[PDB]
Amino acid sequence: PPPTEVIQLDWWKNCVLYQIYPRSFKDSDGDGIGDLKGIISELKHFVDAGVDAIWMSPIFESPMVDFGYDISNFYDIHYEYGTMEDFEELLDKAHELGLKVLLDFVPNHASNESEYFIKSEAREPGYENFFIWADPLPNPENPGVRLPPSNWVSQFGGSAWEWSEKRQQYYLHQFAIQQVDFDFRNPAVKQEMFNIMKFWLDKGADGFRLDALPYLIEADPADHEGRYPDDPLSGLTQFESHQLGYTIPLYTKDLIELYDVVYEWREFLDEYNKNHGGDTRVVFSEGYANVSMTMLYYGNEDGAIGAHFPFNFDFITDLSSKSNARDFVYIILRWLTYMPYGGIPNWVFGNHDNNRMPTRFRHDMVDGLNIINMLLPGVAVTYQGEEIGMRDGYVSWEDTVDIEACNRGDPDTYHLYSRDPARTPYHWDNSTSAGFSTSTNTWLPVAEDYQEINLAKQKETARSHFKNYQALTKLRKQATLSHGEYDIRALSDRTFYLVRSLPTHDTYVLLFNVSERRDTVDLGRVPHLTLPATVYVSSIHSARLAGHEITSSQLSLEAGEALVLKAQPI
Amino acid sequence: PPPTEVIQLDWWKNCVLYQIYPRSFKDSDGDGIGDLKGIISELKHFVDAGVDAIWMSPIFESPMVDFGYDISNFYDIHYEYGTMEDFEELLDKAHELGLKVLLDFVPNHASNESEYFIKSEAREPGYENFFIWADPLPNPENPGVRLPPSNWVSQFGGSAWEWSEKRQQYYLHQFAIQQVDFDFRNPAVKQEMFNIMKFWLDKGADGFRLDALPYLIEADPADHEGRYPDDPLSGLTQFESHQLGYTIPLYTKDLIELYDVVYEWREFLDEYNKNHGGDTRVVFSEGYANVSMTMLYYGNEDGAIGAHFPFNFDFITDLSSKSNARDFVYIILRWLTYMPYGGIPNWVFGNHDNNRMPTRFRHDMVDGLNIINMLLPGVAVTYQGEEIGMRDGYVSWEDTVDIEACNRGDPDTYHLYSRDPARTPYHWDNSTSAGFSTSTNTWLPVAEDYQEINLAKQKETARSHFKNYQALTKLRKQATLSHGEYDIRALSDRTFYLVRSLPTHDTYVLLFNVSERRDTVDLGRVPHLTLPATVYVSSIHSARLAGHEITSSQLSLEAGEALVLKAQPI
Ligand SMILES: OC[C@H]1NC[C@@H](O)[C@@H]1O
Ligand SMILES: OC[C@H]1NC[C@@H](O)[C@@H]1O
Ligand SMILES: [Ca+2]
Ligand SMILES: [Ca+2]
Ligand SMILES: [Mg+2]
Numbered sequence A, B: 001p002p003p004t005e006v007i008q009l010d011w012w013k014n015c016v017l018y019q020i021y022p023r024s025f026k027d028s029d030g031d032g033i034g035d036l037k038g039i040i041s042e043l044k045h046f047v048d049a050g051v052d053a054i055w056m057s058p059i060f061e062s063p064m065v066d067f068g069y070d071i072s073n074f075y076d077i078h079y080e081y082g083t084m085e086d087f088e089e090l091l092d093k094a095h096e097l098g099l100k101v102l103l104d105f106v107p108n109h110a111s112n113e114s115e116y117f118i119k120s121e122a123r124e125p126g127y128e129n130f131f132i133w134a135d136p137l138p139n140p141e142n143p144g145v146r147l148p149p150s151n152w153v154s155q156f157g158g159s160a161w162e163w164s165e166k167r168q169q170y171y172l173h174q175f176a177i178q179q180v181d182f183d184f185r186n187p188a189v190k191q192e193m194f195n196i197m198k199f200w201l202d203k204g205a206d207g208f209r210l211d212a213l214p215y216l217i218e219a220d221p222a223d224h225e226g227r228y229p230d231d232p233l234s235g236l237t238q239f240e241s242h243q244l245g246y247t248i249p250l251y252t253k254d255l256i257e258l259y260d261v262v263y264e265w266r267e268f269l270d271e272y273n274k275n276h277g278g279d280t281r282v283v284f285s286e287g288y289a290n291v292s293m294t295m296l297y298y299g300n301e302d303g304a305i306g307a308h309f310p311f312n313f314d315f316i317t318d319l320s321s322k323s324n325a326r327d328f329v330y331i332i333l334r335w336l337t338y339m340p341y342g343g344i345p346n347w348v349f350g351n352h353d354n355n356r357m358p359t360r361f362r363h364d365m366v367d368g369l370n371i372i373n374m375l376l377p378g379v380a381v382t383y384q385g386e387e388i389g390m391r392d393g394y395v396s397w398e399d400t401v402d403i404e405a406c407n408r409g410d411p412d413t414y415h416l417y418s419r420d421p422a423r424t425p426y427h428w429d430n431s432t433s434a435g436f437s438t439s440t441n442t443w444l445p446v447a448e449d450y451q452e453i454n455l456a457k458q459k460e461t462a463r464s465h466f467k468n469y470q471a472l473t474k475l476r477k478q479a480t481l482s483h484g485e486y487d488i489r490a491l492s493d494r495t496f497y498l499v500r501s502l503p504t505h506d507t508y509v510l511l512f513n514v515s516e517r518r519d520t521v522d523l524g525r526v527p528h529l530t531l532p533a534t535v536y537v538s539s540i541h542s543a544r545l546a547g548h549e550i551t552s553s554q555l556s557l558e559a560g561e562a563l564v565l566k567a568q569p570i
């Protein structure tokens, strides 16, 4: 039977999306700080890797308190990264190579060094109500003893309320003291968000990652007898009143009103795509929330439409080296069971806020994890370094610069909080500072294992994480991966299968031993697998090379061993 | 092609198992109390319903403090239910009809009126160490105040430690003061459990339900410097130190040592079966625990073999009227994903300790829930009344007799705790006391809806819960249900499918709208469903009767509506 034609999908429905952390990708000018000229110089890397789309962490003007998530000017480039002209060059060259480019949009908060905040604190007309400003809580017990409006706790520790001597009021910060929460009930704030997105779409951005959306809106004091209501206490004894986890964020996170803002953004974007034509511009939302609250980002039962997708963080939050094959299957099934019909699935294995994929799992699991990412239906999301199996870098207390570690931690505890280990410079090669920089003085220390783990080494050697990555992004061109069904089950506590099948097209089968022990399985239990079949990709430690023929229905897999098999059509 | 032949399964691998609560099934002698002669008089009901096996709640000599779970003689019958002769007659007549009969084995504890406890409290040789006896915790600062050995809390509220004046020590009771915990580190206790099981297997019992196994073993004081260690505090403000929920049962529940006892019971039972022949005698374990601790009842990765299965309580603990179709699918997938390879799955929708199925869900969902039970692979478990859709009965504070309600509750709270609503007498017909008794003075009040919900009415009327139950138990004789594959996915937030398929055999498809709203679905999305197909079973208010032909790919389902479709073989 001739292989059926499939209707090609819009680019965003099955792209490989790569997150760049610009400060740590490529330093072009020897200051130990990654920059836009650095990115331009290695845009060819994304073509070589089989990446369709890049999203950059924030590159806008910022005092760098939260390394770019504290934005003082939403309309220009951070000087350490380069100039507006460098950004326009990046977009032109990325587009020439057929890549899509997404920017990190940070709508929840602005730098306390923004004109928005300076004018708001000064009560200039039109800015007075731009942020959440609150009087001290009345103190009938001791009148005029200053109390915060409520018990709300910052994501970076301490009160979410900061006193302004100038304004004689508290402002809200869910993040750092320097990150001031906008009032999303103010129509002028909502207009300014459209102004920012229009500016960057007009420059030719292909869309946005939407930062920290669960924290957009907090309880209206009009609904709580003219005060900000206290969040419920957790009652967990390990947390004092200044420590994140002391409260349950009932009045400060996942408010139903936030989704109305997201649906308004999507309406604006749909209108922009209709009026401008060309490639669909998209929004992908960031929010760590339960399944119900996560799926509302897609849209609601009234038929409102939201983000093209909310990020799926399940491989960060719900799986690790403690997981067995049944855990892998049960967590993979969660997105696919709960996602609305017509929704596009996505898979995230890492980001700049979490430990690196091989550290959360094991070094011998890198290939199997990248195979899951690329072989599951929908969109594969890769964090800078996953394509070469980068591990967390050692960062001392002395070298730690993450506000979350510095605010929540001390020399003895900082490792529980710090995001710095996942932000160490990218391993290009075995030259000074792993080819990230010509300087030995990098903004974070280069990981100690860059001699063993670097892109140039993996491009030369016969078998590598990066060559596996390339083989997998290439496989995504096949109709079976773009349009095929999926079947996923555990064969044992150690090994699971994932079958992509499509009548008249080749069958692809992942077999993954996620355990630390050898496992023998009966391939006769795998649906749509006829033997003999051919190894397409194997873990770097597999006895099987690509082109190896599987003939026996009895298969032994070593600890961490993953195979992709190519089998005849069904 | 002619239909493939299937190998006969051992009876326990696909039985319909019905839980009888004897006190509430049938009263033969007008005292308002269900009894063995009553059960004998209605054994024909199980044949009529298509039940393969019955298990009875406890019928052994008991002061009835916990209505039979407080046993004073494990070797004789409770006088209110009948005599040993009545029990032997029940086994003879059940076996003559082809039924298996299992007993409720209560190994964790004995009545304080048992000879074991009387002798143990008297420090009689051979009995002194039969229960968990402990000295008060030293009170150096305040030696005039006796302290219990630890902060452990009873499942029925209050301290798990009761002072014995006679023995001048505390004994452990995880359940009622009158339910004394055996010492499962005592070889003499372990031998007595074999003696009890052998006694009843020798009488002709086909196996046991194993009661309350998570509570078998508690921390050894030898591991905690000669004291019983305190359970950790929950920190939940709604519970004071005498209230269940005050502690996390780290030292009192799910200890790894309990499974070694279960594996020893299975070894004993395998040897008994080997030495006796005839129908395999089985054990089904009761335990409410997390997934890991539940699956250890089947066996362990080292090859130990435990219960034939642990009960699956997921439709009690994890699904309700709050659940949508995606929840139904994700919870059904939990047992099927985590159960060990070669394990027999089972499905429990109710029991005498939980609210009745139609009360936990909705009255309009009874048929769909009975269809899930019967159509999923493995063993269907039915609690007395589910075959006619019995609802919780109203029980006033004055009529309440459940120790858990009387200990934990008051006239204002009792309803939060009481199990009595699920124990009201069975609805045979619309006669006095719904045909359960000739007496109006029933041990619990007959539910007010018995004239509307009763077996005789459902046998006379053209469409009924009972007639659907009969059709479904009949359907389980088909190779597609005994040996077929399964596929389960949600079509929407409201409707899911469950497909049973087997090459050369008819395909069976459940479609169930679990929502309170209508839903229209595309049957083209259902695997292995070729149209036209025939309605095999419909919910009692479905627009479609058994025999109705489904021709259109678009299907509108009412709230609660459930269909089983019969479709051509794959
Ligand atoms: O902007 C708030 C937070 N979202 C992403 C994190 O890196 C940042 O601190
Ligand atoms: O025997 C202890 C407990 N297990 C079953 C319940 O009905 C009983 O109270
Ligand atoms: Ca906010
Ligand atoms: Ca015990
Ligand atoms: Mg630089």
Ligand SMILES: [Mg+2]
Pocket (backbone or CB within 6 Å): A353, A354, A416, A417
């Ligand atoms: Mg963290």
Ligand SMILES: [Mg+2]
Pocket (backbone or CB within 6 Å): B026, B027, B028, B029, B030, B031, B032, B033, B034, B035, B080
């Ligand atoms: Mg009676």
Ligand SMILES: [Mg+2]
Pocket (backbone or CB within 6 Å): A487, A527, B487, B527
């Ligand atoms: Mg299939």
